């Protein structure tokens, strides 16, 4: 087990950790989250009781170090920090454990939701999308914009997702104009899989990370990335059979986990009605199709 301890909780805040959310009152005695399952990336995030503007949070992996939360009264947020003194972090995690001022991450024996939502997400890739290498953990918020968004001001605060553009030279081979635009297999398989991502796990990792940033922070640019990487698979006639089956599982859990009340902004009518009913892979997403129709038949 691993622990994200807290200095204190000086301002009323809603804390979410992966798919969960909970409330802490101003100066209630709160000193973090313990029993965090090792082996996955995690996200810890914050929505202040007073300014629901700006959800912000930190992606991290406990294997990569000892991380703690301190509220900064100058900058006005809960900041993730690293304790390099292993020996002294180990010690205070005990008094936190012994005074029972840490909540227990529910290690439920009937779930795999977080595993499944983060199967291919790896801290090393996250940190190439969110560039800030002095820290081992990665900060994200509501308002950060993507590299592609900045094209159409500050790039250090960028989400450096892989640029997908269906009406670009990268995507369209000269002389196969009609072919490559109606069947994107070349772009997915040769440009992106073999060229940029190298394998489908790195692709699937970005897709999953993009969906998670859209849901927990309502990052609009991430949602556009998620929908684009979905649309490119579904608009390719030729996809490794292994990818298709794994994609069905990925999307299944993303839709499962989505807040029912959030489906109006974060889901793109066009992309899904096309992926589920018009595209090459309309018959290859059985679980995803079934759960979309029982839950959100309105959108379709």
């Amino acid at each position: 087990m691993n622990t994200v301890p807290f200095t204190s909780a000086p301002i009323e805040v809603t804390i979410g950790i992966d798919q969960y959310s909970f409330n802490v009152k101003e100066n209630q005695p709160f000193h973090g989250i313990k029993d965090i399952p090792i082996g996955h990336v995690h996200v810890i995030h914050f929505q202040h009781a007073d300014n629901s503007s700006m959800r912000y949070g930190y992606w991290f992996d406990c294997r990569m170090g000892n991380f703690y939360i301190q509220y900064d009264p100058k900058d006005g947020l809960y900041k993730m920090m690293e304790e390099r003194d292993g020996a002294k972090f180990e010690n205070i995690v005990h008094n936190f454990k012994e005074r029972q001022m840490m909540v227990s991450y529910p290690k439920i024996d009937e779930d795999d939701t977080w595993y499944n939502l983060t199967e291919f997400v790896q801290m090393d890739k996250i940190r190439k999308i969110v560039r800030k290498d002095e820290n081992q953990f990665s900060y994200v918020d509501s308002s950060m914009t993507t590299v592609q968004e900045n094209e159409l001001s500050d790039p250090a605060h960028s989400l450096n997702y892989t640029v997908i553009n269906f009406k670009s030279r990268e995507a369209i081979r000269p002389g196969h104009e009609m072919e490559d635009f109606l069947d994107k297999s070349y772009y997915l398989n040769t440009v992106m899989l073999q060229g940029i991502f190298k394998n489908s796990s790195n692709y699937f990792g970005e897709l999953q990370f993009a969906f998670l940033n859209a849901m927990f922070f309502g990052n609009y640019g991430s949602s556009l990335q998620w929908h684009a990487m979905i649309e490119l698979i579904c608009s390719s006639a030729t996809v490794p059979k292994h990818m298709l089956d794994k994609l069905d599982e990925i999307l299944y859990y993303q839709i499962k986990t989505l807040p029912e009340q959030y489906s109006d902004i974060l889901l793109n009518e066009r992309v899904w009605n096309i992926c589920l009913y018009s595209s090459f892979q309309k018959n290859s997403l059985h679980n995803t199709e079934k759960i979309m129709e029982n839950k959100y038949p309105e959108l379709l």
Partner: protein, 237 residues
């Protein structure tokens, strides 16, 4: 953005631009097989590409051979239109390339944009106008060179004959749209008007009769009446 009533006069400024119409690119005659089923038989078509300021027409003839062995021909027509338009731009000197291309149907936007990726400073635009360029095959000389063609062929015309010697582009475009709209509404009557006077000939290097200015007014009024009338006969008004 889209081209409508409101920004109509942009067409006649000094920015080079072209209209592309694709309605006569893929043409069929539907018929019955011996088994009582229906098949199509394609006939030659045209891409109608027009400089509205100069009247230059680049008539690209689409030979029926281009369709042999191809599926989903109505979708293929739009990609072939775009491929041929980009080849025309590519073949022109840079200072002759258009700064805009206006497609008369929205289904052409994506095909052309994709074929024109090499030209990002060329704006591809739809229009909200119901332009009558489908009627271009009611112009005898254009229909004839399309039907006779044996191979792919580009033929160049000035669809305004010598009119610009005497009138402005705006007025010439208006006359042309009036003529084509009439031909579209009742070809027989439109044609009968143009030729009622056997003495007003069509010059070998022209498409339309050599009317005087006074005869153009008479003609233009007669085309207006036809277009109103055929509205009554259709709507009963």
């Amino acid at each position: 953005g889209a081209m409508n009533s409101s920004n109509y006069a942009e067409l006649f400024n000094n920015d080079i631009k072209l209209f592309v119409d694709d309605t006569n690119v893929y043409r069929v005659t539907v018929h019955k097989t011996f088994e009582g089923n229906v098949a199509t038989k394609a006939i030659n078509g045209c891409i109608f590409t027009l400089n509205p300021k100069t009247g230059h027409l680049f008539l690209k003839i689409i030979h029926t051979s281009v369709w042999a062995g191809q599926k989903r021909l109505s979708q293929l027509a739009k990609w072939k239109t775009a491929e041929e338009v980009s080849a025309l731009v590519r073949s022109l000197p840079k200072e002759e390339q258009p700064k805009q291309i206006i497609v008369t149907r929205k289904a052409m936007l994506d095909p052309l944009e994709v074929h024109m990726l090499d030209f990002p400073n060329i704006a591809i635009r739809p229009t909200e106008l119901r332009l009558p360029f489908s009627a271009a095959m009611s112009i005898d000389k254009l229909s004839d060179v399309v039907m006779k063609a044996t191979e792919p062929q580009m033929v160049l015309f000035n669809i305004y004959d010598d009119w610009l010697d005497r009138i402005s582009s705006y007025t010439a475009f208006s006359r042309l749209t009036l003529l084509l709209r009439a031909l579209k509404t009742n070809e027989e009557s439109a044609k009968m008007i143009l030729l009622s006077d056997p003495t007003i000939t069509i010059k070998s290097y022209h498409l339309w009769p050599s009317f005087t200015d006074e005869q153009w007014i008479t003609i233009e009024s007669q085309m207006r009446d036809l277009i109103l009338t055929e509205y009554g006969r259709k709507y009963n008004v």
